Amino acid sequence: ANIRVAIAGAGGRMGRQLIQAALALEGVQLGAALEREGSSLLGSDAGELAGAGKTGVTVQSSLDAVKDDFDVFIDFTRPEGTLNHLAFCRQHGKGMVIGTTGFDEAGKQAIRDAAADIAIVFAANFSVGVNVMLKLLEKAAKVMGDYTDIEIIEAHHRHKVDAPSGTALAMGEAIAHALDKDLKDCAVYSREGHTGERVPGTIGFATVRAGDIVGEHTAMFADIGERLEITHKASSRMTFANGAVRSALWLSGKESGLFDMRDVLDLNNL
Amino acid sequence: ANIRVAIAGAGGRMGRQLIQAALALEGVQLGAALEREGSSLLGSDAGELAGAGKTGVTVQSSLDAVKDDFDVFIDFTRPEGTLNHLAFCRQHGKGMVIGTTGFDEAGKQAIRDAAADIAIVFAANFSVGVNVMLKLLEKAAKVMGDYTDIEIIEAHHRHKVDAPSGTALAMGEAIAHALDKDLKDCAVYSREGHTGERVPGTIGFATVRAGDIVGEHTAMFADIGERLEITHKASSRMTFANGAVRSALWLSGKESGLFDMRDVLDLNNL
Amino acid sequence: ANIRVAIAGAGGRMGRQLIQAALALEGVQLGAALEREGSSLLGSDAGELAGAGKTGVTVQSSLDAVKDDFDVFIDFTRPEGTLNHLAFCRQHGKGMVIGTTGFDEAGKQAIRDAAADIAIVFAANFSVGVNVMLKLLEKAAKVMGDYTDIEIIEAHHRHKVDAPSGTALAMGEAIAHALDKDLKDCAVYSREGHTGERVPGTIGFATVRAGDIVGEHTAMFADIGERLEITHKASSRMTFANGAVRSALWLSGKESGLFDMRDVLDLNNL
Amino acid sequence: ANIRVAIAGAGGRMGRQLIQAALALEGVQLGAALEREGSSLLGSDAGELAGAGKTGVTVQSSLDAVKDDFDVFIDFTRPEGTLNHLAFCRQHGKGMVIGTTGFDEAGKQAIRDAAADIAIVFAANFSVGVNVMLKLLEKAAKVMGDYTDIEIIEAHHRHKVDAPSGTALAMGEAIAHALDKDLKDCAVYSREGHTGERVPGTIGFATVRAGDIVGEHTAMFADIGERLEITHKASSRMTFANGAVRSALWLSGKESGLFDMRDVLDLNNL
């Protein structure tokens, strides 16, 4: 019952979860369900896709076709698709929640630029948990980070291709900044053979790849005699679907500006 | 080389660690080393006790004997001993770092009262780690605490007699307050047989007792799809010795008032 | 391409997973797909249900209807349903893989009795992982169990109603037997207030209930100076679907007898 | 009250623990306490060193001086020292428990050779826990190792110089053998940048270095839907002192042969 949303990528891993997350969320209605033209346009929506009910909400291929059908557009697709939707939403004040990744500089640039006519939440990671952990780790670095050893460990399924995750990296920068240094001057990503002694001031990263682990991140601050650990474990991708939808909702009343989860979660004044 | 400290309880589990912690700390000198009269007054100090060097600093039995020998008094003994030292330090402006526990109301009351003539740091738990975790858990409860399930797990050695630790309890109150409720209205300490379903809004506590674990505390905030955990592991009692000494030092320049670790660590503005 | 299986409960939480697990497994074909008569008999199978392909394999309501369609019958339904299927399979030598739980003594009794005419794998827990852990914990108890403190911790989602899980309980008995004692003479399930000291020889159990955790079990053997932990984490119910299907397959060539996972996994000679 | 032992290295990190472990153990008496000639020959033993009692047992510098004073010799010193003691014990049938590491091939060779005249327990790691875990991990690999991803994670204090520990390496070989392959053909020790996908069949190792962690080892076997983890956490070096002393005792009645913990712990028939 409020704000309607459109879900681009409706049959992809993220669009389904996004449908379930949307229904399930209150204060949000499911306006449109896009997919691209050429697929089996997998039975005009419903629980069709999102294994849910049925919903007279049926998947489509046309942006202008639905224009009056949603208020906020949520995208977890591909940079190229995004940029198109971006142009349309921008044309007709339609807010975006964007979680597609891998833009090039030009990519990102359109986004900030579309951001003065529409309201956009753009974020790398939409898990609330993760966004809080990043805030915590700062504080934490404030008082313990200094004199404590700092090591980040992250585990992911056997098909993740980049080591150490992007979240581990953000964790790393979050801290290094806190200590007001540069991640690049103090990071160590590998430890094989005779290393000699751990170097004070660095931030080691350890990386585990196995099974279907969706994502676990732990930050450690070790002194002599005690350890503080802050771990975030994602159990399923619903974790981002939930936080995308929460932000769609938060966009309510919002005319324009570029935002992220700190904005949504008000981690700022926190 | 600065501020000298006296260490009451010099041959007890805490007084040794406290000697090592003191030497090792910089900006602090070891002025006096008390024990009570009647013991083997275990070879007038040194590495004697604290397995350290030797130090022309030799253990004693007389408060007035050392009065000019230390500036700050650190006590991890017994309420009764404390109250005495308390009276002496109070007489002659001598600051206290107090970590003795188990006062009765009258106990605590003398303390606050001695607190207008001398400067005292009185704390239940002097581990920095723990004190930060407690600050974090609040913040955390702020944004996730609400709609997330909250469970505290703590492990301790097989001779701890009270379940769930005092730290778990403080963890619990730290949160419940954050959510602005009462720990007493929402706590669950045991789960045996047919419980039926977990009740939204409660804070379960699980308690593990085994071996020589000095102390591990984990707070969990579980949603559907993700978990944030904040764990503090004490590896040795040096963790409190360190933070007692850090507070002794912090007391420098301090005339009077009652304080604790939030004060020492400035967790306040944090 | 081999052995066909029928999946009773085809639209329940377990029957879908069981369909996916079956296709995906090799050396196994999907013969029949039952549901009971009266439901929306959720579109005669396929990826219909198990979000899979389509499969000319369509859900049904009639046991005799499919009799020539499967070789082994897999049941994760209700005791009452089971007992029926049981009678049919027993009539016409059809092997069972049974994972339905909660029989009464009479229940279990039919099962052992059907077991001399057909081959049945009956198990409480069909996760391979868990079945290995239970074997390990014995061995383990053999050499460390004795003089080490033993504590079992288990976490499950907020709608589990019985504390401490059935797996924790089996873990407990697995050990107690190893030490050749009785679980009932040495178990402790709760620890609230002044407990006094941990009692040598007992097996404490700690129980965590939160979010959507599907199931985590940890067994601890703590001495002075070291801890051995054996943890099994279920990430999704596919873990049992997989092991049910593996047993269906194992049943190949098997005329009759009652078996379980130790049999399937040959944990016996292990 | 039985078997006396001599402890070479009596003031080193290991010799003290070894004294405490010895007294504390029953069925073992403390015969001699060596150190080398030139040190402060730290007050002829007692709780002197091992912070224990006093013991008319006083530290020495002469092997022949004590020859009638102990039955079994325990060494955690240096290869060079070892080789000497080795020659003496060999001369006069005196059993050895050896935990000194870093021999060269010639080193090891003397040992096996001294092993036909005296009885020696020679082991890299004397923690019982670790020795059981290694046995478990085999079994485990037997049934799950194959099709599961295998990752070893180990943490150690900030002054350990070799990555991945020797225990992680032994863990690795223990498994690889189980699967009957070669550790060297399937190990991966580092994961930095674009790795591409995890390769089936390898054994990744992740390495954490921080604070004063004495040693934590975890072996993981991950499938789709479940994980089995076997973790061993050393809390203090007493863990090896205990197992050295247990082996000294086990040596009782033993004339000659080369042995290790599997022998002591009978992990063989296990």
Ligand SMILES: NC(=O)c1ccc[n+]([C@@H]2O[C@H](COP(=O)([O-])OP(=O)(O)OC[C@H]3O[C@@H](n4cnc5c(N)ncnc54)[C@H](O)[C@@H]3O)[C@@H](O)[C@H]2O)c1
């Ligand atoms: N930021 C976050 O927290 C977060 C989390 C998870 C994934 N993601 C991102 O979300 C996106 C979705 O990934 P996914 O796992 O759903 O995988 P996927 O392959 O299932 O997603 C592809 C989806 O996008 C649609 N799409 C592709 N190209 C398109 C085009 N040109 N025009 C229109 N529709 C197009 C596809 O039709 C499909 O629906 C990715 O960019 C991923 O990087 C982000």
Ligand SMILES: NC(=O)c1ccc[n+]([C@@H]2O[C@H](COP(=O)([O-])OP(=O)(O)OC[C@H]3O[C@@H](n4cnc5c(N)ncnc54)[C@H](O)[C@@H]3O)[C@@H](O)[C@H]2O)c1
């Ligand atoms: N607050 C913290 O973070 C923290 C942490 C650990 C322990 N503690 C507390 O510190 C204290 C020390 O415990 P401990 O493990 O050292 O055990 P312990 O038995 O070793 O401590 C006893 C010490 O106090 C001395 N003492 C006892 N009674 C005395 C008296 N009447 N007058 C003078 N000296 C006296 C004893 O002589 C001995 O030195 C306890 O109160 C404990 O509750 C606090």
Ligand SMILES: NC(=O)c1ccc[n+]([C@@H]2O[C@H](COP(=O)([O-])OP(=O)(O)OC[C@H]3O[C@@H](n4cnc5c(N)ncnc54)[C@H](O)[C@@H]3O)[C@@H](O)[C@H]2O)c1
């Ligand atoms: N042993 C294991 O490792 C294991 C693991 C998980 C669950 N289980 C068990 O498997 C079963 C399935 O649970 P579920 O989560 O799929 O939940 P569910 O509610 O989805 O399962 C019910 C399914 O059984 C069918 N069914 C019910 N009554 C029937 C009847 N009289 N005749 C025929 N069909 C009938 C329903 O139609 C439905 O398909 C339960 O008994 C559960 O205890 C066992």
Ligand SMILES: NC(=O)c1ccc[n+]([C@@H]2O[C@H](COP(=O)([O-])OP(=O)(O)OC[C@H]3O[C@@H](n4cnc5c(N)ncnc54)[C@H](O)[C@@H]3O)[C@@H](O)[C@H]2O)c1
């Ligand atoms: N195998 C195990 O499980 C295990 C565990 C821990 C350490 N270790 C080994 O045990 C040994 C002890 O290490 P440590 O931490 O006690 O450190 P350390 O520096 O305290 O040990 C040195 C000790 O050996 C003595 N020593 C040195 N050279 C000697 C010589 N030539 N002749 C006689 N005495 C001599 C020193 O006097 C001192 O007592 C090392 O080899 C270490 O690698 C083994």
